[PDB]
Design a protein around this ligand. Structure first.
Ligand code: ADN
Ligand code: MET
Length: 488
């Protein structure tokens, strides 16, 4: 039973959540749900990044105060993430008392430890700098400790060779942010308090739970808890250099690892407003469900930093072929005979213990795939099993055994076997498709657990069910694109 704290980058409170942002939150959510399925203590945390010029600029545009805007933005963001079933344990804000206190604490410790330097610059003004260069050797060692992604470890080497420089962490009024203690008119640069927002969001969660020990257990220097940050390749510098150094210099633990992902493209190109491929998360949900996108992204994700392409044409074909025709089909083609011919009761023995064992034996490799973030590999393995299950059903041909008087026992054995194979597949896909999983659990009259597959459902009553998942079509994609054009 590990203790894990997982975060997603904090979205700026200056715009709506789009499909690009969703790649990150969905990737993290699938991993998080799998970790919870394996029994670990997981804390999935996020928050809105509500300070700085990005927010100040937007607030000005629509003539509204930052506090009012960030409030509305926070609500809109959370509604969208909830719509995609991103299971955060806490979604907070960088503009909070928790973040202010922790930002002041870390700043005070850095200054006291001699890592803060002061210098004037050009109109003139005194600024405060973080002495990142004094952490080079430690960062080098940490970088080479076999944790980071190869592509990331290599990118950092380029940065180390270019030489680390002191970082300007102060900004002058007027600025929407936290005031620097003992420095009138000076504010902390947004990127200084933003990552501290991870800590602020966790402190908020601990305080809400009335938990007075967890914060220190997770952030103290010799913590045995694991800390992971899911981020895009454009903010790796802040998370791999500035951030770990800020923590080191203030007596806090550094990240256990950074999980970096690439960018989402649509139809092979960067999202385009004029073409209707710049799609907002809220707009997507008006046309499709969350599971469809979660599945598509997951099928293409890996442990590398490669870009992920949402080919709209391929989207419809893949969702129907895999979810509808392979997985769900396994249940619908066997459930009829069971509910009508056997009052929903499954057979008392496995018709083919061998085949079932093949399915449960795959748990090791599939679980390792979810764990290592090789999502594409996990999906390929799962669909390979689905093909196997559907082939079994074809060979046994229940529709033939159905019209053969006196073969009821054989029929129930065949169809129950298929439903049990479906049970295993839905368990492996549970981290990916939260809603379909709930519908499957209602049908099976069972909660799906990772170890539960070792015990197939025998002499078990299943419920009748309406379509678990309907096919989607290109007309819906056309509507989505047209709607997206109209919003621009
Ligand atoms: N088009 C995109 N594809 C994937 N991630 C994105 C995209 N645009 C922004 N992000 C991610 O959103 C996070 C900020 O909310 C960053 O980690 C960033 O990399
Ligand atoms: C603490 S992660 C902050 C990420 C930043 N808001 C970005 O949108 O890039």
């Amino acid at each position: 039973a590990k203790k894990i704290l997982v975060t997603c980058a904090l979205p700026y409170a200056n715009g709506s959540i789009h499909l690009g942002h969703m790649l990150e939150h969905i990737q993290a959510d699938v991993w998080v749900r799998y970790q919870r399925m394996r029994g670990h203590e997981v804390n999935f945390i996020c928050a809105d990044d509500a300070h700085g010029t990005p927010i100040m600029l937007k607030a000005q545009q629509l003539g509204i105060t930052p506090e009012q805007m960030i409030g509305e933005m926070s609500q809109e963001h959370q509604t969208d993430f909830a719509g995609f079933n991103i299971s955060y344990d806490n979604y907070h804000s960088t503009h909070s008392e928790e973040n202010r206190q922790l930002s002041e604490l870390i700043y005070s410790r850095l200054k006291e430890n001699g890592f803060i330097k002061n210098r004037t610059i050009s109109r003139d003004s005194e600024h405060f700098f973080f002495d990142l260069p004094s952490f080079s050797e430690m960062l080098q060692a940490w970088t080479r400790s076999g944790a980071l992604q190869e592509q990331v470890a290599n990118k950092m080497q380029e940065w180390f060779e270019s030489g680390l420089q002191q970082w300007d962490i102060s900004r002058d009024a007027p600025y929407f942010g936290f005031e620097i203690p003992n420095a009138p008119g000076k504010y902390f640069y947004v990127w200084l308090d933003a990552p501290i927002g991870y800590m602020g969001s966790f402190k908020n969660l601990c305080d809400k739970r009335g938990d007075s020990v967890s914060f220190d257990e997770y952030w103290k220097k010799d913590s045995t808890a694991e800390l992971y940050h899911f981020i895009g390749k454009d903010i790796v510098y802040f998370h791999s250099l500035f951030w770990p150094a800020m923590l080191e210099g203030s007596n806090f633990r550094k990240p256990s690892n950074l999980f970096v992902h690439g960018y989402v493209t649509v139809n092979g190109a960067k999202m385009s407003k004029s073409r209707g491929t710049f799609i907002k998360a809220s707009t997507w949900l008006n046309h499709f469900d969350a599971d469809s996108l979660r599945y598509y992204y997951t099928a293409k994700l890996s442990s590398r930093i490669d870009d992920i392409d949402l080919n709209l044409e391929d989207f419809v074909q893949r969702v129907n072929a895999d979810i509808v025709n392979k997985v769900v089909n396994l249940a619908s083609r066997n459930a009829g005979f069971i509910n009508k011919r056997f009052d929903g009761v499954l057979a008392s023995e496995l018709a083919d213990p061998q085949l079932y064992k093949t399915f449960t034996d795959a748990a090791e490799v599939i679980g390792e795939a979810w764990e290592s973030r090789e999502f594409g590999k996990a999906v390929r393995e799962i669909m390979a099993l689905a093909d196997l299950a559907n082939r079994y059903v074809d060979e046994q041909a229940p529709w033939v055994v159905a019209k053969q008087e006196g073969r009821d026992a054989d029929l129930q054995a065949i169809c129950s076997m298929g439903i049990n194979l479906f049970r295993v597949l839905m368990t492996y896909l549970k981290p990916v498709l939260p809603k379909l999983t709930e519908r499957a659990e209602a049908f099976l009259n069972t909660e799906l657990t990772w170890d539960g597959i070792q015990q197939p459902l025998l002499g078990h009553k299943v419920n009748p069910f309406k379509a678990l998942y309907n096919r989607i079509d290109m007309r819906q994609v056309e509507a989505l694109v047209e709607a997206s054009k109209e919003e621009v």
